[PDB]
Design a protein around this ligand. Structure first.
Ligand SMILES: [Mg+2]
Ligand SMILES: [Mg+2]
Ligand SMILES: [Mg+2]
Ligand SMILES: [Mg+2]
Ligand SMILES: [Mg+2]
Ligand SMILES: [Mg+2]
Ligand SMILES: [Mg+2]
Ligand SMILES: [Mg+2]
Ligand SMILES: [Mg+2]
Ligand SMILES: [Mg+2]
Ligand SMILES: [Mg+2]
Ligand SMILES: [Mg+2]
Ligand SMILES: [Mg+2]
Ligand SMILES: [Mg+2]
Ligand SMILES: [Mg+2]
Ligand SMILES: [Mg+2]
Ligand SMILES: [Mg+2]
Ligand SMILES: [Mg+2]
Ligand SMILES: [Mg+2]
Ligand SMILES: [Mg+2]
Ligand SMILES: [Mg+2]
Ligand SMILES: [Mg+2]
Ligand SMILES: [Mg+2]
Ligand SMILES: [Mg+2]
Ligand SMILES: [Mg+2]
Ligand SMILES: [Mg+2]
Ligand SMILES: [Mg+2]
Ligand SMILES: [Mg+2]
Ligand SMILES: [Mg+2]
Ligand SMILES: [Mg+2]
Ligand SMILES: [Mg+2]
Ligand SMILES: [Mg+2]
Ligand SMILES: [Mg+2]
Ligand SMILES: [Mg+2]
Ligand SMILES: [Mg+2]
Ligand SMILES: [Mg+2]
Ligand SMILES: [Mg+2]
Ligand SMILES: [Mg+2]
Ligand SMILES: [Mg+2]
Ligand SMILES: [Mg+2]
Ligand SMILES: [Mg+2]
Ligand SMILES: [Mg+2]
Ligand SMILES: [Mg+2]
Ligand SMILES: [Mg+2]
Ligand SMILES: [Mg+2]
Ligand SMILES: [Mg+2]
Ligand SMILES: [Mg+2]
Ligand SMILES: [Mg+2]
Ligand SMILES: [Mg+2]
Ligand SMILES: [Mg+2]
Ligand SMILES: [Mg+2]
Ligand SMILES: [Mg+2]
Ligand SMILES: [Mg+2]
Ligand SMILES: [Mg+2]
Ligand SMILES: [Mg+2]
Ligand SMILES: [Mg+2]
Ligand SMILES: [Mg+2]
Ligand SMILES: [Mg+2]
Ligand SMILES: [Mg+2]
Ligand SMILES: [Mg+2]
Ligand SMILES: [Mg+2]
Lengths: 59, 386, 136, 78
RNA sequence: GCAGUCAAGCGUUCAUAGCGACAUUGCUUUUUGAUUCUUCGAUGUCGGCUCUUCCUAUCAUACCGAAGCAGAAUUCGGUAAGCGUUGGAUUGUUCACCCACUAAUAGGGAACGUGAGCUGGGUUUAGACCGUCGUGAGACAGGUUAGUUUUACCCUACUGAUGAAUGUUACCGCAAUAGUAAUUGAACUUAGUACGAGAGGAACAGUUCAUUCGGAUAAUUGGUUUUUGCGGCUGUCUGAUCAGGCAUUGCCGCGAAGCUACCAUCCGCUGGAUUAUGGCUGAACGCCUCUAAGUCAGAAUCCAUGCUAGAACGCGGUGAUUUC
RNA sequence: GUGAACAGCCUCUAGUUGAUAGAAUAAUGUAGAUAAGGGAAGUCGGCAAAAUAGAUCCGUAACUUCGGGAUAAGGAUUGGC
């Protein structure tokens, strides 16, 4: 279930230190941070779900 | 006295003597059983070991910690361009053993096989098989009865085929001739299949199929004269010992007062024949097929031939066998592959394997790139180039 | 191996001959494990009984809790360093050679296991599965 | 059948190839070969080694057209 | 040292399930003794290392029969030597005795197997210390320490290697005879089933691995480096530069190709006839009986199947067969 | 010249280039070497081999006939410009 995070590269998972205003973390306290796991921004078959957005309508 | 600590002997007396073999072409000492009821076809094939490579495939061993998982296995690859039938032989039961009763050869004969019947080709007048080529002139007549003789008697029948060596990147020229048992119905039906194929051609896909258990037969690589230690797996004598340590200390006991047959000695290591059983075919590839190397999963267009070629061999342009694992004899050697002599219910055999990926990366180093495609795609462009 | 390990160990290159000494990976007081034999291993004059991942060996303690000293107990090899290979095609090696003292029933004596652990081993002993963190 | 890359050099590692190393901190390291692996054990640093991807990105070598303009924008309104 | 016979006893009862007195008859030649036939114009004894073969009075493994065999376990026996019989602490030791694994860690022969095969630790020359003895030189089957292990080119045996003569020469073949090889264990499942009051507690089929052994092979991984192949380094010498020389391969990292490793991967076949033993039919002996005639089933055995040679005085088929 | 140095290694002067050859590169050797993981399990016994090594600086035990032990041990640093 871990989410992707734009621009982390790496087809693997890693454990980043996150903050306010940043993907995959909503804080719990004024100036709190948590170090959490994240899946990369490079698609693999490890992925349960891709999330995609249309920009040109085909035929 | 008796030993002190019993421990098992070295070597295997079943492989004696350990002499150089009497020909590079190990001998099909035996042939599959015959059930004359299936269609008639060949029971072996002639080849040239090109080398080995690696394969990735899933596994189907319902039980094992690697069931339905990927594994990577080594595979050799023998160069196997369609053999050509040029003669036929019928044998007979005789209270002394089997006995060749006649051969019957085709009319025209490739200089490839004619080559074989010689030692100083270029000089000779190449008269081989010209008075024989006659006997067709007259209607047939003689050739007729000969075939006809075979049918009346002949308890078994073998084909005289020969490798089309010219299609093999070898430098050899002199092609390889050999007998091959025929295991299809009725001796009479057999010789017909024989006759009908003279001058003409037989291909591997008509002898062998994917996932089928085959046996290899070839003469082992050679290593010349050998110390007792390596030739027999003998313990090194300890360091302190005068006059050498790659020996045997007690070459024999007093009585019986002779060095015996059962005790190891220094001799010729290698260049033995071996019959090697139970190898499975992982691919029966066609030469009129670009992307042999490809797979249902891989898809990229590539022949099996690794970058910069097979080390020490050539480039594999024809049809081939690919066998799970390793094969007696070395690269560029004439190899026989043979239908097995019993049907195996091995589960480990019958497993219907399916390749996922075939290593195309050069074996002249630590290769990274399968295709020059893949290469140019990764490094970018260089000081030559566009 | 053997008794109390459910599962089956595919062969991996031995790398721990008798007399080798390996880091103790748990917290029993034991600091090192010195190997004196290897259950299962067999006979061939002058071969040394060697052990690999998830093997069980009789061992002693050279450095550690004076109560764990001067006697012999079973133990379980969990880290290698002698590059073995799995069926998946890869050759891999740990940084040390490491074990965790255990009872015959394959049970730990330790609270947990410091450091990473071979999966070949995890699958073998359920209680090493427990106390392990990072596996392979 | 994942293909991997080299923690040192950074070149693709087809299956079976190279060597894997499991460090103390439980960090992993794949090498395509003995070559990298040695340097790695030598404590050499990738960006000082000329033929390495890590090195190459840091020094901007022949990236040319990856910093070249693409075209992917549309019109919506609804 | 090993094995019998008689059967008083032991064995709750009960002679012989397992044992067995008093007597008695034997085998063995890894004990020791007795002898002194052979070796004194001589050539080391101990032990180990290594390597082969053989024996069976069989520890384990295959198939059996018996039990004071409910299961599990274990004992007694039969066919059996096909196969295996390990790793260490102290000791020069054999022996001994512990630690530990193991399926089991059986016992013996081969000039008390094996020194131009090794080692030389003990013993057993010369040096030396101590104890005991002796006036003394010296002595000790007492403790100590130090102390040169020579020759193969010959014959034969063994391993491998050529090879004249049976017209020449070439290709393809058969198979006499010889050798022959595989092994042992665990886990899952059977199944907490059979049996048992309970505690406990199996096995045949099936599957997944594993040990010891063997024969290959180098895709991969590792080792190796005179590829002196590429880069680096010291010292000096070529005026400097460029590029190189020397340092018994000067040194260092990488290093292809080969060679190579349970340090790497691959492969190791299935039929028949038997043994013991349990049986069928069945007389002898109107009954009974596996046996006398005849017959069934059966083992890590045996003969094949397979595999390795291929008789250079065993051989078949086939091609071409010379003119100055 | 390097360097503590009549050491090793290279060179000037002078002196040599003498020691049967040629082709190969099997086993077994002699002499020179490296080897994964383990680390005396080898062996009568660490036999052999390997590890150490210069210099500057920090640091230095028992015991002692106070002279020692002692480079004890244990450590850092070292080119070039
Ligand atoms: Mg014995
Ligand atoms: Mg005829
Ligand atoms: Mg060529
Ligand atoms: Mg081998
Ligand atoms: Mg030996
Ligand atoms: Mg000596
Ligand atoms: Mg290569
Ligand atoms: Mg030994
Ligand atoms: Mg202490
Ligand atoms: Mg965990
Ligand atoms: Mg390498
Ligand atoms: Mg640029
Ligand atoms: Mg009774
Ligand atoms: Mg009584
Ligand atoms: Mg006498
Ligand atoms: Mg009773
Ligand atoms: Mg009972
Ligand atoms: Mg019996
Ligand atoms: Mg020993
Ligand atoms: Mg000892
Ligand atoms: Mg004695
Ligand atoms: Mg005792
Ligand atoms: Mg005797
Ligand atoms: Mg003797
Ligand atoms: Mg002798
Ligand atoms: Mg001697
Ligand atoms: Mg002596
Ligand atoms: Mg003396
Ligand atoms: Mg004393
Ligand atoms: Mg002495
Ligand atoms: Mg001396
Ligand atoms: Mg000699
Ligand atoms: Mg001879
Ligand atoms: Mg002749
Ligand atoms: Mg259960
Ligand atoms: Mg009861
Ligand atoms: Mg290599
Ligand atoms: Mg250089
Ligand atoms: Mg310089
Ligand atoms: Mg000079
Ligand atoms: Mg000199
Ligand atoms: Mg080779
Ligand atoms: Mg293996
Ligand atoms: Mg083997
Ligand atoms: Mg067969
Ligand atoms: Mg076979
Ligand atoms: Mg038969
Ligand atoms: Mg009978
Ligand atoms: Mg009868
Ligand atoms: Mg009778
Ligand atoms: Mg004869
Ligand atoms: Mg002959
Ligand atoms: Mg004959
Ligand atoms: Mg003839
Ligand atoms: Mg001379
Ligand atoms: Mg030559
Ligand atoms: Mg010892
Ligand atoms: Mg020494
Ligand atoms: Mg070193
Ligand atoms: Mg120091
Ligand atoms: Mg400085």
């Amino acid at each position: 279930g871990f989410p992707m995070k734009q621009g982390v590269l790496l087809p693997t998972r890693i454990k980043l230190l996150l903050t306010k205003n940043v993907s995959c973390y909503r804080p719990r306290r004024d100036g709190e941070r948590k170090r959490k796991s994240v899946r990369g921004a490079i698609v693999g078959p490890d992925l349960a779900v891709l999330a995609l957005v249309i920009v040109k309508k085909g035929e | 006295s008796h030993r002190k600590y019993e421990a098992p002997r070295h070597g295997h007396l079943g492989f004696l003597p350990r002499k150089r073999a009497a020909s590079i072409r190990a001998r099909v000492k035996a042939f599959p059983k015959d059930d004359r009821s299936k269609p008639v076809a060949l029971t072996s094939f002639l080849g040239y070991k090109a080398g080995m490579t690696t394969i990735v495939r899933d596994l189907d061993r319902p039980g094992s910690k690697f069931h339905k998982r990927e594994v990577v296995e080594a595979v050799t690859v023998v160069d196997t361009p369609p053999v050509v039938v040029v003669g036929v032989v019928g044998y007979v039961e005789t209270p002394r053993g089997l006995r060749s009763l006649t051969t019957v050869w085709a009319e025209h004969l490739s200089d490839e096989v004619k080559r074989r019947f010689y030692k100083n080709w270029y000089k000779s007048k190449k008269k081989a098989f010209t008075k024989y080529s006659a006997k067709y002139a007259q209607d047939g007549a003689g050739i007729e009865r000969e075939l006809a003789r075979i049918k009346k008697y002949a308890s078994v029948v073998r084909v005289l085929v020969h490798t089309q060596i010219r299609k093999t990147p070898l430098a050899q020229k002199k092609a390889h001739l050999a007998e091959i048992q025929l295991n299809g119905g009725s001796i009479s039906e057999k010789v017909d299949w024989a006759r009908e194929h003279f001058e003409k051609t037989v291909a591997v896909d008509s002898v062998f199929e994917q996932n089928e258990m085959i046996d290899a037969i070839a003469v082992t690589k050679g290593h010349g004269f050998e110390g007792v230690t390596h030739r027999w797996g003998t313990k090194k004598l300890p360091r302190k010992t005068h006059r050498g340590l790659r020996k045997v200390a007690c070459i024999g006991a007093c009585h019986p007062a002779h060095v015996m047959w059962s005790v190891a000695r220094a001799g010729q290591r290698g260049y033995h024949s071996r019959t090697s059983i139970n190898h499975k075919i992982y691919r029966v590839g066609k030469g009129d097929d670009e992307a042999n190397g490809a797979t249902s999963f891989d898809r990229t267009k590539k022949t099996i031939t690794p970058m910069g070629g097979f080390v020490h061999y050539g480039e594999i342009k024809n049809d081939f066998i690919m066998v799970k694992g390793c094969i007696p004899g070395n690269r560029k050697r004439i190899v026989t592959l043979r239908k097995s002599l019993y049907t195996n219910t091995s589960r480990k055999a019958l497993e219907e394997v399916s390749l996922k990926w075939i290593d195309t990366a050069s074996k002249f180093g630590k290769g990274r790139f399968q295709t020059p495609a893949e290469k140019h795609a990764f490094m970018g462009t260089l000081k030559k180039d566009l | 191996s053997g008794n109390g390990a459910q599962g089956t160990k595919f062969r991996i290159s031995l790398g721990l001959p008798v007399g080798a000494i390996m880091n103790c990976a748990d917290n029993s007081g034991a600091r090192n494990l010195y190997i004196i034999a290897v259950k299962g291993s067999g006979s061939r004059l002058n071969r040394l009984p060697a052990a690999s991942l998830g093997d069980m060996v009789m061992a002693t303690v050279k450095k550690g809790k004076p109560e764990l000293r001067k006697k012999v107990m079973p133990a379980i090899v969990v880290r290698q360093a002698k590059s073995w290979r799995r069926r998946d095609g890869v050759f891999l090696y740990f940084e040390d050679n490491a074990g965790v003292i255990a009872n015959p029933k394959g049970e730990m004596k330790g609270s947990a296991i410091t450091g990473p652990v071979g999966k070949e081993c995890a699958d073998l002993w359920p209680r090493v599965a427990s106390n392990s963190g990072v596996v392979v | 059948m994942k293909v991997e890359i080299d923690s040192f050099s950074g070149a693709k590692i087809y299956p079976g190839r190279g060597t894997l190393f499991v460090r103390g901190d439980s960090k992993i390291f794949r090498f395509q070969n003995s070559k990298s692996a040695s340097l790695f054990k030598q404590r050499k640093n990738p960006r000082r080694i000329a033929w390495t991807v890590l090195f190459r990105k840091h020094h901007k070598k022949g990236i040319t057209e990856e910093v070249a303009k693409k075209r992917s924008r549309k019109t919506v309104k609804a």
